[PDB]
Amino acid sequence: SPFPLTSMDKAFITVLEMTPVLGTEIINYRDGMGRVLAQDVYAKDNLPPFPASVKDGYAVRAADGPGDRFIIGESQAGEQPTQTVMPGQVMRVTTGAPIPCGADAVVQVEDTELIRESDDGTEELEVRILVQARPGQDIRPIGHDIKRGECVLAKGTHMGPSEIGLLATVGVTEVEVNKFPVVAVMSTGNELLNPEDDLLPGKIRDSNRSTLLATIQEHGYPTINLGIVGDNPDDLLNALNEGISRADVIITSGGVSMGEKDYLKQVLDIDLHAQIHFGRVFMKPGLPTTFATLDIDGVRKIIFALPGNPVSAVVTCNLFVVPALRKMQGILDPRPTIIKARLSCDVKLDPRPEYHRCILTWHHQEPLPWAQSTGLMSMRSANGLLMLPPKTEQYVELHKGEVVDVMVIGRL
Amino acid sequence: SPFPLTSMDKAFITVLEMTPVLGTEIINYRDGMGRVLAQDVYAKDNLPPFPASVKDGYAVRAADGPGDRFIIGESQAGEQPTQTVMPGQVMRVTTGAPIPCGADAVVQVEDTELIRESDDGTEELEVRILVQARPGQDIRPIGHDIKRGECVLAKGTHMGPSEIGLLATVGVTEVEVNKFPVVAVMSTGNELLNPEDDLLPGKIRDSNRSTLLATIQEHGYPTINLGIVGDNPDDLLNALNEGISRADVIITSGGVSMGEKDYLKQVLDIDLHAQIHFGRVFMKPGLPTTFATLDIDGVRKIIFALPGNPVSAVVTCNLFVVPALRKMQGILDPRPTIIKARLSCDVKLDPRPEYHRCILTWHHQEPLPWAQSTGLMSMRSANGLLMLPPKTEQYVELHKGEVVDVMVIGRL
Ligand SMILES: C[C@H]1[C@H](OC(=O)CCC(=O)O)O[C@@H]2O[C@@]3(C)CC[C@H]4[C@H](C)CC[C@@H]1[C@@]24OO3
Ligand SMILES: C[C@H]1[C@H](OC(=O)CCC(=O)O)O[C@@H]2O[C@@]3(C)CC[C@H]4[C@H](C)CC[C@@H]1[C@@]24OO3
Ligand SMILES: Nc1ncnc2c1ncn2[C@@H]1O[C@H](COP(=O)(O)OP(=O)(O)O)[C@@H](O)[C@H]1O
Ligand SMILES: Nc1ncnc2c1ncn2[C@@H]1O[C@H](COP(=O)(O)OP(=O)(O)O)[C@@H](O)[C@H]1O
Ligand SMILES: [Ca+2]
Ligand SMILES: [Ca+2]
């Protein structure tokens, strides 16, 4: 089988439709970066749990109005006050300290003048309140920010630092989340040497394994290095079986064209009994990209057999593998972010949709970024993939300045 | 000292000007994600190191033209050929295999017809070449992609997956890079409990430590958890001394206003003998944000004393701390990426420049993203910080749809 040419849209949709969502596990909240909640999270306490001052100043009775007041004590952060403010009295407060019984407003220190103090100046005795406070001013009532019983995070939330801080706030230190996929990577070819090797006749160094592993690691997922596998079916089958045992996802590169020494598709079908959903994609680069699933004991393994050309391998990894991994780790909409950018140079269109790494840059006050195709600008890694449309009889070329879609693949 | 109000621009520039660049170390290339090269990197081999076929097909003499040819053997990937192609002969080749002596072009299999084979069909014997090849066609000459002696990566390059793959390609498996900063984080306040604690009267859980540690970890830097420190100068000094010993950067939160129990600025100046460069910033939120340096034995430590309010702490961490850490790890221009976005709702301007977390979203074919201020949209973490200008007599409010600056703080 020279597999049918699959459209890019059909290939991508097929990857997402066929990729499973992984099961769940309980983690410590500090380990939650990039995880997706598999439970709703509720507050068991009010925040604040006591009425809390917003200001350094004095807790007062608003009904007393402005005037001169006896200071009966201080409320400091972390201590519950024991005294009750009666008419004509106030209590000093600091930001975050509890409001004492009998007070209903806070007056910030700037709206006061101190009018009696102890001889040694350490104890405030009488203060002039210069304003009419409104009841409740500069107080966070109990539960103002979070109420006991409130759902503070919904299942499906993809967590970042602020969500971790919210779990800390509410004391929910263990949470149910989707698992991350474990991703195994192998390279294929009799010509490949390890990066650590000196060259030998007829040989080159394996770069795809490093590039692909780094790409997956950049997204936070655990990886397994399956090494270099020669161009023979027995070795390929054994390496695939090891990947299936050790990982949720297997990525290979090389050996997927129709060459005399290309065995991977035959091994996947006849030996592994995997279901190849597509074996060619009408895209540039990436024609021989292959995607398969394997259902064993009610678990679905997914296999990407990427082209061997290094540029093709990293482009197809970003287009197909990353969205699948995002679905596996529970992200509800796992699709890439697409930004509109201006082409930095003219480009010829191909009958196939074309993809190329680029750098996105925003310029002073200009609203749209520019996309500069790769290959001081060299100090930056690629953070985008230009997505060029197929040529038509009408449109054969795009011009500098014209707006194109760019897929985000790195931090901007 | 109620410290002077420092403009945002002066505060930010001061942080970057006063922050050092860390020294260098040698790392394994697989550990290079996010590192900055401190050396130029050179290729010691050509790529390809032999003339390499781009195609499955036949190595031919272009001068023979089209016609029927004897196939004298095969060149397979990873094997140096030993035979010389003479007039009237060709050799089978596969993609990435070396071109044999005597051949000067490759004809892809699609431009041929097989016209003699062995009885068992395993050996090709004669092929009809249907095209006139151009000399050099479908061959990558030695060094076409990389030449021995070529600088392939310059010092100052901020590495991603493709740079790691390039180090693998050229066999440079150990590289000199800038160190990453080690960042210590402490929280302050007598009211704070650990996230793991049940509440006690007058107390709340410490969230800032978790949020700040997660923010720093998201950027890839090692962290040290200095815990909760009470509101007293001895304990604050001891915790700062531990941070200085263990880390390059110390982040505190809380205790930086003028309150009765706020000691940190006094401790930094009088006890630690640090140089406080600013102690207030004209910004909303973040008024009491403080930045200090401490020079010990020719090493500069940097200290950020952030406000205690949780929103203020995470906003000021993203504005001031992250750019400093990027400078420390060697990034040449460590400043944030600013994108233009449309406001999703009307906003009132303040005399101070105002900052608020938001979510940036790109809509179908609309060129500019929308910025939706925080507090299915809830499934996403904040990836931006709205940067609102100070009000003027002319401009008091911004309206839905108007374009504003947004600082990127998360993956888009
Ligand atoms: C065909 C459409 C797909 O559409 C679906 O996947 C529908 C089923 C589903 O949403 O699961 O989305 C994708 O992702 C973005 C956000 C950009 C990237 C594009 C992919 C690179 C190609 C498929 C295309 C693509 O366009 O839009
Ligand atoms: C005042 C200018 C500063 O300008 C310098 O830092 C000049 C000295 C130097 O470049 O080192 O850059 C910054 O970073 C961006 C990219 C956006 C973020 C802004 C900061 C939030 C505030 C400072 C401002 C800022 O605007 O531009
Ligand atoms: N891991 C790798 N690192 C670098 N180059 C590779 C790697 N794997 C394959 N290549 C190169 O990519 C090209 C395409 O290889 P491949 O996809 O295996 O084609 P075929 O299936 O026809 O052998 C060849 O030049 C090959 O040497
Ligand atoms: N680590 C923290 N976690 C959550 N809230 C905090 C933290 N530190 C301080 N806060 C709260 O932030 C607010 C401001 O505190 P802070 O900056 O210490 O003010 P002051 O210096 O006046 O005591 C208070 O409500 C305080 O309880
Ligand atoms: Ca191969
Ligand atoms: Ca405090």
Ligand SMILES: [Cl-]
């Ligand atoms: Cl390809």
Ligand SMILES: [Cl-]
């Ligand atoms: Cl603040």
